[PDB]
Structures are given as structure tokens and as C-alpha cells.
Amino acid sequence: VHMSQERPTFYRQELNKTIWEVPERYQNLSPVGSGAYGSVCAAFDTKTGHRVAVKKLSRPFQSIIHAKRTYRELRLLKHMKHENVIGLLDVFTPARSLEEFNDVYLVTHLMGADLNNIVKCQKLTDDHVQFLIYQILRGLKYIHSADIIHRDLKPSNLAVNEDCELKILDFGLAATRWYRAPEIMLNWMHYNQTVDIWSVGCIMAELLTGRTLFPGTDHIDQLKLILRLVGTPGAELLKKISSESARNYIQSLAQMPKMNFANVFIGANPLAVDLLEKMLVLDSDKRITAAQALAHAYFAQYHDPDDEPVADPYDQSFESRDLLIDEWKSLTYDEVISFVPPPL
Amino acid sequence: EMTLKFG
Secondary structure (H helix, E strand, O other): OOOOOOOOOEEEEEOOOOEEEEEOOEEEEEEEEEOOOEEEEEEEEOOOOEEEEEEEEOOOOOOHHHHHHHHHHHHHHHHOOOOOEOOOOEEEOOOOOOOOOOOOEEEEEOOOEEHHHHHHOOOOOHHHHHHHHHHHHHHHHHHHHOOOOOOOOOHHHEEEOOOOOEEEOOOOOOOOOOOOOHHHHOOOOOOOOHHHHHHHHHHHHHHHHOOOOOOOOOHHHHHHHHHHHHOOOOHHHHHHOOOHHHHHHHHOOOOOOOOOHHHHOOOOOHHHHHHHHHHOOOOHHHOOOHHHHHOOHHHOOOOOHHHOOOOOOOOOHHHHOOOOHHHHHHHHHHHHHOOOOOOO | OOOOOOO
């Protein structure tokens, strides 16, 4: 391949009954977990001197659905270049050609402590909460500007280091429901980027109080807890709900007013409570956006409009393509080949 | 913002 990177030396090892063939660069691999779509080892990146997560995708081209999902994840990870968002440090295959291309490895930021983990051994100050939520919204302004929706924000998807610096991880490539917006939990209407703002509101409330905000046990129990705080849907929102059955169910509920959040959160920063009221609006079209939230006075000590960048536009037209397995595979291989590592 | 302990 014209002007491609030199192929590193690979070495083979079996780890949890899985063959891993990775460049010499990655040393001291040790298993961290396994999902349905791949398994993850922590490793020492001898090129950067950092510990990294190396994900080997599990049979990435098994079907059309899996092959397209593999391409979607690689396209997503290659696009995102932001301090508060997971970035692709490396992607490699041991294959020297498309004909032997079978395995895909993704190298990213190693999840040490997530947000749940950091509260288990300390009490966060309001300064800590301000900075953590600011970084989530700064990352979200970036991904939303490219028309990317995370879809599954929760504390276990937010990595935090010892400097209280945060990265958004584990994007939804399309479990607890406590952080999910009501309009997607019951499929009331289409996914909008406003669903990520709802999740931030749930996360922030939990960081401020130490209690999960809506810890329901099923979808109905959860909806009733949500509606108790934010009120039943008004007539404007009911018009936007597409399923008639969902509308009839909502209209069957005893009407409830929105609660006064200041009563619910006595002792919390009033600017924090004001921001929460703007994030946990039931109508998604009235929720504050990530860009607007960064300008809220709650973040006055961190907000810098010259240091809150937006993303390049992200071409998602591939999503409407209907291709053979080997075509998605060939597209994925092209993206592995075209990958340019980040500097340093 | 200062510093956090690792669990």
C-alpha cells in the first residue's frame, strides 16, 4: 500500500482461551472484561508510556449486522478528537491483506476509575461537581455538533483520573435505565441529542445528593418516579408522541404538577438546582442544550467560549447503505489502512 | 478540581 505505515512485529499469546496477536509495542496484557462484541485487555503502550485498553472485536464480520456495526464503531472512534471524549489511539490487524483480514483490534483510553468508583472513597466538593459536569457538557457540545448522540450516558461510562479530568466512553452503537430519558425508555418518539442532556441531569443530581434520582425497578415504576418530579405531559408534548397506545396510556395517568426543585434539593448551590431544572424538562425540545448549558452561571469559573471546540461534520450516509458482508468488511479494512495516529 | 483519591 502506497505510503502506508511500516508493519510492526506482532507476537501471539492465548489469554482467556482467546488468541491475541498484537504489535510488540503493547506489553503485559491482562484481561479486564468481555462483552458480546469483544474482549478487553489492559496493556502497557511502550510507545506512549501509558496504560491502554486493547479491545479485540469478537467475530466482527460474522453477519451483515455485525460487519456494519464494526464499521460504524471504527468510523465513530476515528472521528472523535476531543479532550473529554474517548479517542482512537490505534487500530490494527495482524492481516497483511484483505483476504486474510479477520480480526480488528481497537486501542483506547484505559478506564481506571469511573464516576461511581470515585464516590466510593471520597465526598465530592461542589467544585468537583462543577468541574466534572462542565467536562461532560464540553464533550457533549463536541459530539452533538457532529450530530452524534451518545444514547447511554451513565456514571459507569465516564472515566475520571486523579486530576478530576473526565472522558466520555462507551458510545451506544445501537442494563440500568435510571439515566435514560423517558421518551426513549418507552419509545415515545425518535432519538434526539437532548436525551444525553437528561442523562447529565440525572448524573448531576446524584453527584450533589449521593442518591440516585430515579431508581425505578421496571419501565412503569421508573416513569412514575420521573413524572412525580417533572409533571405529567401537557397537551403540547402529547402531540409529539407517535404511538396512539403510548398517548392513551399517558392520558390514563392522574395529572401531576411539576415539583419545585428547590424544595427537593435544599442545601445545594441554587445555580446547580437552576441548571438541573433546565436539564430535566420532560419535553426534550425545551431542554437546555450542551452549548447553552456551558454558558450557565453555575460554570462561570470554568467556562471559556474560546476553549469549547466543535467537531468536524460527520458523514453518516453509510447508515442507509445495504451492502454485502464482504463489502462492509472491505470498507472496514480501508478504514484500518487509512488510520493516522494522534501526535505524541 | 484539585485532586482525587483512587479507590
